[PDB]
Design an enzyme around this catalytic site. Structure first.
Site, short mmCIF file in Angstrom:
data_model
loop_
_atom_site.label_atom_id
_atom_site.label_comp_id
_atom_site.label_asym_id
_atom_site.label_seq_id
_atom_site.Cartn_x
_atom_site.Cartn_y
_atom_site.Cartn_z
N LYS A 38 -104.32 -93.76 -44.60
CA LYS A 38 -103.06 -94.34 -45.09
C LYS A 38 -103.21 -95.55 -46.06
O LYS A 38 -102.36 -96.46 -46.05
CB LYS A 38 -102.11 -94.68 -43.91
CG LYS A 38 -101.88 -93.53 -42.93
CD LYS A 38 -101.24 -94.00 -41.62
CE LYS A 38 -102.21 -94.75 -40.73
NZ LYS A 38 -101.61 -95.10 -39.42
N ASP B 297 -101.47 -94.77 -31.83
CA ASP B 297 -100.01 -94.80 -31.80
C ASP B 297 -99.39 -93.55 -31.18
O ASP B 297 -98.33 -93.66 -30.56
CB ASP B 297 -99.39 -95.13 -33.18
CG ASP B 297 -99.86 -94.26 -34.33
OD1 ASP B 297 -99.11 -94.15 -35.34
OD2 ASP B 297 -100.96 -93.70 -34.24
#
Ligand SMILES: Nc1ncnc2c1ncn2[C@@H]1O[C@H](COP(=O)(O)OP(=O)(O)OP(O)(O)=S)[C@@H](O)[C@H]1O
Ligand SMILES: COc1ccc2ncnc(Nc3ccn(C)n3)c2c1
Ligand SMILES: OC[C@H]1O[C@H](O)[C@H](O)[C@@H](O)[C@@H]1O
Ligand code: NA
EC number: 2.7.1.1
Length: 448
Positions: A156, A192
């Site tokens: 990312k 996450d």
């Protein structure tokens, strides 16, 4: 029709999705086995999060969340509930990451993280309090234990040098030592996806899948211990972080990759990596739409073949704009304002084309994502004996939560691909913070 012929390239037939699903299942099986875990595009990383036979500590916990556009520090109170354990975020603070820190070393990044923790503990009268630390780290980690694991590689757009291949928990503990201000008992490091699943489990014990559709895209699930060959034991279940974003990195998605997908990848911070994620994630969606509009302008099918300075610049078409364009009521007011701010003066048909381009990219993302989840769910079905598998999926991410139609197209496509499965979808309320604290509360009974 010419616009519609270009947009048709984004279509995925039921057989295309079943082919993606089958190939995802194949890659998942490969990642779990010793002979293929190393070459596997779908890493299937063991998290050391087991289906616990009770033993949780109650009280206040400090939760860290690194992975998003920014960085969050929060206080979460954990206690003995009906189900087992209740959890609530009581205090929180968001911190932005500087340019020189993101470009800088791991020790530079983690010192800034440690500086943010000091700022939070000072502005909350709790520096003198020795709290257990829960760490949500939204990146691929090869775990040795619940509180030990190395960063495989950044995803990312992250670039902090001297981080990859090093113990992340080790970097944080060393940064805390380098400060001397406070003291933290770094108890757990969870992804996450995992944090999301754990927080949803207390609301529904059938929650054994965690999925994130935000900046990035990933899933975790409870695998039978005998199938997790990279860990010892055959009893119970362990949570496995698929790291499915990297599916396609060994050429699994080549027949589905488009010119826009190839352009996003070449210009990304990680060329050749996270290909499946690049078809779904919020980091890439708006950029995919931008490249489609640019194709339409060169073909003289949009804005009279004239693009603005902003439209020709990378990252200008934000992912939230895709969601806003698709929220338009039909009056074109929302589409016009987005395009006007981008320095364009669109016609009624230009607005309609931009809507169609947005729907084409977001529908493909929902359908591609659905094939992945269906793969995980059908794999779990196969490793179990019952008439109908009833499972709950815990979800987080702005793309899944905020996009007007993604959720529904996604649910409908998953159900289609999962016969004899009854799927319930639950959204996580402060999942990253609460999940990390809940894992920490159980892990405390052994370490602290
Ligand atoms: N209204 C919106 N609709 C769809 N996507 C959005 C919207 N707003 C922001 N995004 C995008 O979604 C991403 C932010 O997702 P978040 O849920 O905040 O997760 P994150 O913490 O930034 O990182 P992860 O990987 O999702 S845990 C960015 O890539 C944005 O471009
Ligand atoms: C579905 O499985 C679950 C559901 C809820 C949980 N809540 C806290 N901790 C869990 N697992 C942990 C933590 C530490 N270890 C070694 N295992 C956990 C596992
Ligand atoms: O944040 C969503 C996901 O994004 C990226 O794919 C990461 O590699 C993965 O760890 C994370 O779960
Ligand atoms: Na095993």
């Amino acid at each position: 029709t010419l616009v519609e012929q270009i947009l048709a390239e984004f279509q995925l037939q039921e057989e295309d999705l079943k082919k993606v699903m089958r190939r995802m299942q194949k890659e998942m099986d490969r990642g779990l086995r010793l002979e293929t875990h190393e070459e596997a595009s779908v890493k299937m990383l063991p998290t050391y999060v087991r289906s616990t036979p009770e033993g949780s500590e109650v009280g206040d916990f400090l939760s860290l969340d690194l992975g998003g556009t920014n960085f969050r520090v929060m206080l979460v109170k954990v206690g003995e509930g009906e189900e087992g354990q209740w959890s609530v975020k009581t205090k929180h603070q968001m911190y932005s990451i500087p340019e020189d820190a993101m470009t800088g070393t791991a020790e530079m990044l983690f010192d800034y993280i440690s500086e943010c923790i000091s700022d939070f503990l000072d502005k909350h009268q709790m520096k003198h309090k020795k709290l257990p630390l829960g760490f949500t780290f939204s990146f691929p980690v090869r775990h040795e234990d619940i509180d030990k694991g190395i960063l495989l590689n950044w995803t990312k757009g992250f670039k902090a040098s001297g981080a990859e291949g090093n113990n992340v928990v080790g970097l944080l503990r060393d940064a805390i030592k380098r400060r001397g201000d406070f003291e933290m008992d770094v108890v757990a490091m969870v992804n996450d996806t995992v944090a999301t699943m754990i927080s949803c489990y207390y609301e529904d014990h059938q929650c054994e899948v965690g999925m994130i559709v935000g900046t990035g895209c990933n899933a975790c699930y409870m695998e039978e211990m005998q199938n997790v060959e990279l860990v010892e034991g055959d009893e119970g279940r362990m949570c496995v972080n698929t790291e499915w974003g990297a599916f396609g990195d060994s050429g699994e998605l080549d027949e589905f990759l488009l010119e826009y997908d190839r352009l996003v990848d070449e210009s990304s911070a990680n060329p050749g990596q996270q290909l499946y994620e690049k078809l779904i994630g919020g980091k890439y969606m708006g950029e995919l739409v931008r490249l489609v509009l640019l194709r339409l302008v060169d073909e003289n099918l949009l804005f009279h073949g004239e693009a603005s300075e902003q439209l020709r610049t990378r990252g200008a078409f934000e992912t939230r704009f895709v969601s806003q364009v698709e929220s338009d009521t039909g009056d074109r007011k929302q589409i016009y304002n987005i395009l006007s701010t981008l320095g364009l003066r669109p016609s009624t048909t230009d607005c309609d084309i931009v809507r169609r381009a947005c729907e084409s990219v977001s529908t493909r993302a929902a359908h591609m994502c659905s094939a992945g989840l269906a793969g995980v769910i059908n794999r779990m079905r196969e490793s179990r004996s019952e008439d109908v598998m009833r499972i709950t999926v815990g979800v987080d991410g702005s793309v899944y939560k905020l996009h007007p139609s993604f959720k529904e197209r996604f649910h409908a496509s998953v159900r289609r691909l999962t016969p004899s499965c009854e799927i319930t979808f639950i959204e996580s309320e402060e999942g990253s913070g609460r999940g990390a604290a809940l894992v920490s509360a159980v892990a405390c009974k052994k370490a602290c």
